Amino acid sequence: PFVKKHFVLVHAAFHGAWCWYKIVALMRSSGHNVTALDLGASGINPKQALQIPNFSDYLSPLMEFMASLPANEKIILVGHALGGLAISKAMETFPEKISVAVFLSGLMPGPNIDATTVCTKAGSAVLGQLDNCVTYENGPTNPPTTLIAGPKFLATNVYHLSPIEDLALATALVRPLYLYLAEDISKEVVLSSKRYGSVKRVFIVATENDALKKEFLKLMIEKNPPDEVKEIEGSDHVTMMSKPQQLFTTLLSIANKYK
């Protein structure tokens, strides 16, 4: 009783559609439709970070994709980490086009724990970490403009349990992230219980995530309870790299449950 589904994958900071390559392959081989998107200035998106200081422009690729979805079509929307904010806005805007939303170690703000709160905590876990650095394209009087992930940070905090070739891949592809302002994010991502909250939600925890500590993740799960919490043991931050098969099986299960 095969039922073709449409998975939409949204990456985390510094990454792009490319990070989902193992999952995309498994999905396509299964006969499912899968769309891996590059958010603004990510992957091979043409914009450069400094060219998109407005958060709406970082999210535009997903919003535009959602708006173009055929009528009556439902998707399984998956967001990894920072990608959680993107799918959250998609849920609030197009709740009817989403069968179920999946937050993979994702920022999952809610009415009782808004985006600014989540982003501030998220920032503290990345800014200043190991060899990560910021730039000041607008001068020292202004806030730092972009954040650049360093190879040591990637090796230790993100890809510690992934094949070494995936770390090499990431080092050749990660791009800078514009340090979006708190006020800008708070105005772009506003969630309501009747829209955002009406979409089925599942959170997937990576048990060995050294990028985002469990306390923070548990905080979001507690202050904004999802319909279900799944766990993938032995996974580092990039579950799609370290535990691809398990993630795939888990996504299929989720898709069949909320179809």
Ligand X SMILES: CCCCCCCCCC(=O)O
Residues making contact with a second copy (CB under 8 A): 16-18, 20-22, 24-26, 28-29, 36, 38, 43-44, 46, 48, 163-169, 172-173, 175
User: Measured from the CB atom, is 152 or 259 closer to ligand X?
Assistant: 152
Give me the sheet containing 98-104, strands edge to edge. 33-37, 6-10, 75-80, 98-104, 200-206, 228-232
Which token pair is 259? 């179809």
Which token pair is 198? 């009406």
Pairing state of beta strands 33-37 and 200-206?
Answer: unpaired
Query: Which amino acid would we find at residue 132?
Result: N
Q: Which residues contact 62 (CB under 8 A, 6 or more apart)?
A: 8, 10, 37, 39, 86, 87, 89, 90
Q: Name the residues that contact ligand X, by CB under 6 A.
A: 12-13, 81-82, 119, 122-123, 126, 179-180, 211
Assign 188 to helix, strand or coil. Answer: helix
User: Measured from the CB atom, is 44 or 67 closer to a second copy?
Assistant: 44
Other residues' Cβ atoms within 10 Å of the Cβ of residue 120 = 11
Q: How far is the CB of 44 from a second copy (least distance, A)?
A: 6
Q: Which among a second copy, ligand X, none contacts residue 172 (Cβ within 5 to 8 A by kind)?
A: a second copy
Dihedral sign computed on CA atoms, order 128, 132, 138, 139: positive
Q: Which among ligand X, a second copy, none contacts residue 188 (Cβ within 5 to 8 A by kind)?
A: none
Q: How far is the CB of 183 from a second copy (least distance, A)?
A: 28
Q: Which among ligand X, a second copy, none contacts residue 46 (Cβ within 5 to 8 A by kind)?
A: a second copy
User: Measured from the CB atom, is 40 or 226 closer to a second copy?
Assistant: 40
Distance, in Å, from the CA atom of 212 to the CA atom of 214, rounded to the nearest integer, reads: 7
User: Measured from the CB atom, is 99 or 117 closer to ligand X?
Assistant: 117
Q: Which among a second copy, ligand X, none contacts residue 238 (Cβ within 5 to 8 A by kind)?
A: none
Q: Which among a second copy, ligand X, none contacts residue 118 (Cβ within 5 to 8 A by kind)?
A: none
Pick the closest to residue 157 from 237, 77, 218 (CA basis).
Answer: 237
Q: How far is the CB of 72 from a second copy (least distance, A)?
A: 26
